[PDB]
Amino acid sequence: VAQGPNGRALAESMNPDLLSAIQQHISIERYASVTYLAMSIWCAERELAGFYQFFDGEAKDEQSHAVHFTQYLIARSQSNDLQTLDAPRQNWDSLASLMATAFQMEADTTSSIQSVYALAERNSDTRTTVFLAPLIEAQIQSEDQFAYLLGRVKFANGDPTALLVIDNELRAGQTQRG
């Protein structure tokens, strides 16, 4: 039995380029987490308590997703490399602009997973493509959800009354089409 780079027994070696791609994807999820924290704060500063609660939860969930990837590297006997985390964006001119950034961040998270998937496919690392499939499935639902929240906020057309109604929906947990 051989030992992997993190010292555990090695079931199958992993290409270094794929390892680097997974490590950078963990950074993407960690950055999405702190971005959602920054969004939760922006919303709290404007008394949008439902949006604040929603994004506070999204920040915790994104961190959980990042940790899920760290556990996969442990399972593959690969080293983790927790990286420097950039400061998030913290200023937006409107809730609609913030929700646009949130949607783009969710789509960019999926793009990063897709890139890891394609590299695993090129390397015939089917443990990794199988591992990623349910995460891509979850990303489809998150993209559908964030397109719903963004589109509903844009429908409000900047009317505070409509934005208060949507804020109360989010506080109640009404956060997707259902």
Add this chain to the structure above:
Amino acid sequence: VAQGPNGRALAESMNPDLLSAIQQHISIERYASVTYLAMSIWCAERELAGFYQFFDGEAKDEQSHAVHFTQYLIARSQSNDLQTLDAPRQNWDSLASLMATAFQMEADTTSSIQSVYALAERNSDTRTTVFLAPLIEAQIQSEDQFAYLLGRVKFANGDPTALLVIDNELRAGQTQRG
């Protein structure tokens, strides 16, 4: 004992014109079903999740109504003839215009039942007039319901804020006067 056209024992023969009228009415209900599916999709595309849920349910209910008619033909030992189904309308300029089409479709469904009823009356097929009576009763309630939804949406006068409030009513199941 004689055998009916579908091969079962025949309680009483049915005029071929009335049979054709029932078969075409089944098509009307099947078409209403796919129209409500198209409406549910249009609403989902615009994040009107309550209207989407409402019309998704109406599509299933209209299909159930169609199947109820197929069972009546079986009970009368008559052949069914499931027909080609036209593509539904799929584009509307506004929720108010969609709800107008929905109301007209419900009224047109009743008109079709009324036409079958009148033909059964002319043929003294009292099994069929008796069978249709509770369906007409249900259509009165559906017309009242769709006049309520259409009128409430028109009252909103295209204001997104009012339409979000009504959307949330429908998501909660608040879909008639009560």
Add this chain to the structure above:
Amino acid sequence: VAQGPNGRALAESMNPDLLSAIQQHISIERYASVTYLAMSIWCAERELAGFYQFFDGEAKDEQSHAVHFTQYLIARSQSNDLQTLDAPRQNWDSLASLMATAFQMEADTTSSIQSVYALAERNSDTRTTVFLAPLIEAQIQSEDQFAYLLGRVKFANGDPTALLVIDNELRAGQTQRG
């Protein structure tokens, strides 16, 4: 953020050939649904009440599968295009011949999904291949189930007594190997 063809925020563009393939596959599932309805009627006309109940349920389930695909297109910000639906086959000389058509229809449904899968793979649309995987898994179970029902009916060798016994199995919900 860009807008997709159905107007929602677009996470990732979809090749038009793949969109057309998904739209036509929705038609395949809708056609399977109305075919199972026609089969349920054929069975009811011959007092095969268990087969009638089974196919009545299969018709509703196939429609649900079609709607599941419409929701995926909404999630991808793609337009749906609900198509004209052909009339189903409605005449069979025997239950064995009907079950053969049912099996072939289930296998043909899988073939259609496989074709969409292959096209998504060629386009590196991993959202779609991931989305389709559990549906293919479900199709394996449906093919196993319909091979079981067809084979059990063929084992009966046209004996009414054996067909009544199997009919009662289906009424009781005994519809697969288990």
Add this chain to the structure above:
Amino acid sequence: VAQGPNGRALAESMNPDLLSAIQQHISIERYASVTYLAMSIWCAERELAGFYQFFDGEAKDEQSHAVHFTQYLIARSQSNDLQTLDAPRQNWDSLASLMATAFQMEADTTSSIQSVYALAERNSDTRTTVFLAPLIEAQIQSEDQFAYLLGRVKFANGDPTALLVIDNELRAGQTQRG
């Protein structure tokens, strides 16, 4: 306030021809009851215990239907006239022949109600047409049920094994398509 022929206060006079038609229809239902009793006995004599139990129940139900009509005449302040009851048929060469007689008797019961309905319509006695409508509705279900039992017995094609299986269905209460 006027008094009706049975001595009670009279809400609305009834044409004597319609009264006679209702009184003779009560005889039709009473005769159906004793016919089902005779059928239950024929089945018991051949150890078809499920068919015996089914027809024993049908005899009681048909009597209840007859009494329901006697109550309507009381409600209309009309006299009842309980008539001589013919002896039922008691001999059949086969279960299939008995079930054919049973189906014809059910259809003949509906025909009798239809004839009363048509006469009430000609006399504009809308109390009576309204009273009869749910009874015609129930007759549609009974005709569907007896076409199912007759057709299933004919499918057996005289095989004792198949007839034992159907007999056990009836004992279990499995008496319609469901």
